[PDB]
């Protein structure tokens, strides 16, 4: 159904660099790195992107996102991350938040070099999405964007962010990307129509 299984938007600090890269379903795996190829079929290259606001300090971090990450869609819409960089990648996913054992959105996950972790489960998302939906339905009195956080992945490239680091939010990191899984987004647009 989804012409593209996800669309990626790159950011350096709080400025979006480049156009949102849309990944086609014909491409399960996509690579996000810092090198040549100024085009991109299954390669979103950050090494040739302009940014007037870029600072020397940001350029330094861009040099370390070597081979970057590899985003892989399995089955209907489950996601996996492969760290091809020499430096860990920091991810933000409700999936890991749980699997880890912590509360909803209350953990930053450090994915190590060469690691290959699953960071998003479609079903768990669809279920959890219906839950909180009906939960809000139950707000009776007398006399929606909270749901798409579950269908989204945010990951930083060389700088972590959180209680253990000098950065409070991902928007303070030198280079990160926001990922909207389209299939999960459909279910969202379904859990509401169907609600």
């Amino acid at each position: 159904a989804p012409e593209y299984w996800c669309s990626i938007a790159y950011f350096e600090m709080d400025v979006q660099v480049g156009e949102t890269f849309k990944v086609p379903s014909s491409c399960p795996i996509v690579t996000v790195d810092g090198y040549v190829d100024p085009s991109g079929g299954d390669r979103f290259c950050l090494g040739q992107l302009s940014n007037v606001h870029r600072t020397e300090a940001i350029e330094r971090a861009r040099l370390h996102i070597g081979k970057g990450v590899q985003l892989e869609c399995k089955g209907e819409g489950d996601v996996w991350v492969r760290c091809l960089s020499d430096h860990a990648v920091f991810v933000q996913s409700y999936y890991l938040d749980r699997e880890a054992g912590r509360a909803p959105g209350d953990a930053v996950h450090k994915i190590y070099p060469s690691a290959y972790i699953k960071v998003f489960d479609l079903r768990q998302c669809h279920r959890q999405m219906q839950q909180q939906a009906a939960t809000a339905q139950a707000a009776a009195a007398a006399q929606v964007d909270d749901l798409r956080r579950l269908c989204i992945l945010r990951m930083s490239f060389v700088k972590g962010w959180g209680p253990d680091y000098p950065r409070q939010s991902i928007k303070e990191t030198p280079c990160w990307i926001e990922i909207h899984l389209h299939r999960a987004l459909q279910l969202l647009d379904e859990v509401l129509h169907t609600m």
């Binding site: 020499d86 930053v108 996950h109 994915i111 190590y112 060469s114 972590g160 959180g162």
Partner: protein, 96 residues
Amino acid sequence: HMRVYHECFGKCKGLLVPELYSSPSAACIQCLDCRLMYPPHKFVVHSHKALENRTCHWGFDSANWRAYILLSQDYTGKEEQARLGRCLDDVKEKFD
């Protein structure tokens, strides 16, 4: 010889001394803080007080240390950054 570092459960710096790495278990990296010798796979679980315990670590394999230990940032470009880099690759390629 080799100025080395890693960013695992904190970070650490050290000295890789090629001539000492003559067996998988040979402590050939010396912490630049405690000055002790560490086998490549133990050096990777040695950060000094740098802690980092409110972040979930996924996929940390100590055996995957060849992806963890990197050449110091001490960029003196020219052909020393490349020469020492090539010698670091040799260390990695040896007992696998």
